[PDB]
Write a protein that binds this DNA or RNA. Structure first.
Length: 176
RNA sequence: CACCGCAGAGUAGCUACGUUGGGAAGGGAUAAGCGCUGAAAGCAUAUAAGCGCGAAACCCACCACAAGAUGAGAUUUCUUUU
C-alpha cells in the first residue's frame, strides 16, 4: 500500500507500454517484459500509476510487488545494476575469455561458465590481491541468480574466510 | 548272478566347484535443506506472485510378459461359404 502508492516517474529516454496482461519496457539496453494479473497499471507518459481494486490480503501485497518490479525494470534498462564477487584464498584463479568465465579453485578440476549474453563479465587479478569478478546487467533477477550460482561453487568457510564472497559483506568467523 | 559283483576310465546330456553377463548411463516432479527478485509491514524476509538447485524414495528409463485392454488395437498379403 504505502510502497505502491508512490509514482514510478520515468528517466525520459525509456518507454513503457502495456498489453493484455503483459507490460513491456524499452530503453537503451533491451526490452524487458513482466506479467501482472491483479493490478491496474496505466502509463500517462511521464509517470506510471499502479493501483488495486480490493484489500484482500493478496492484492494489497501484489500492488507493492508489481510497483517495485516495474521500478526495478526501469532503474535497470535505463541504468542497469552490477555486482562484484571476490575470490579469497591461496591458489584461486579467475580468467575471462569474453562471455566465458574460468575459475580454478582448490578442486581437482576447473569450472568454465558460459554466462548468458545478457550479463557482462570483467575480471581484475592484477598482481597478488584477491581476484575480483564484476558482473553488470539490466535484469537484476538474472544477475543475482548468476552471482548466486557462481558463489555456490565454494561457500565461504568461517574459520579462515576462503571462498567466493562479495566485496565488503563481512563474514561470520569463528576461532578454530 | 553275486550292490552296476568289485575295480580303472568315460562321449552326448544334466549340473557347479566352472565360464560369461547384470545391477550402467540419462530425464521429470520433489522431501529435509540451499538461494534470486519482492511486498503484505517505506525496513527486514527463499514466498504471498514468479524463478534456480536438491536423495539409493516416486514417474520414465533396463529386462520379461501383455489387446479376454469386452475400451477385445494397427499393418502386409491371401481367400471372398464345404
Amino acid at each position: 500500500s504505502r510502497i505502491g502508492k508512490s509514482p514510478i516517474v520515468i528517466p525520459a529516454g525509456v518507454t513503457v507500454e502495456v498489453k493484455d496482461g503483459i507490460i513491456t519496457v524499452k530503453g537503451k539496453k533491451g526490452q524487458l517484459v513482466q506479467e501482472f494479473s491483479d493490478v491496474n497499471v496505466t502509463v500517462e507518459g511521464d509517470q506510471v500509476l499502479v493501483e488495486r481494486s480490493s484489500d484482500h490480503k493478496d492484492h494489497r501485497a501484489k500492488h507493492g510487488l508489481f510497483r517495485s518490479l516495474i521500478s526495478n525494470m526501469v532503474v535497470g534498462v535505463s541504468e542497469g545494476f552490477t555486482k562484484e564477487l571476490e575470490l579469497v584464498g591461496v591458489g584461486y584463479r579467475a580468467a575471462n575469455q569474453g562471455n566465458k568465465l574460468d575459475l580454478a579453485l582448490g578442486y581437482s578440476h576447473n569450472i568454465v561458465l558460459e554466462i548468458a549474453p545478457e550479463v557482462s563479465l570483467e575480471t581484475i587479478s592484477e598482481a597478488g590481491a584477491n581476484p575480483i569478478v564484476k558482473l553488470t546487467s539490466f535484469d537484476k533477477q538474472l544477475l543475482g541468480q548468476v552471482a548466486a550460482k557462481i558463489r555456490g561453487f565454494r561457500k565461504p568457510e568461517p574459520y579462515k574466510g576462503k571462498g567466493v564472497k562479495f566485496v565488503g559483506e563481512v563474514l561470520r568467523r569463528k576461532a578454530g
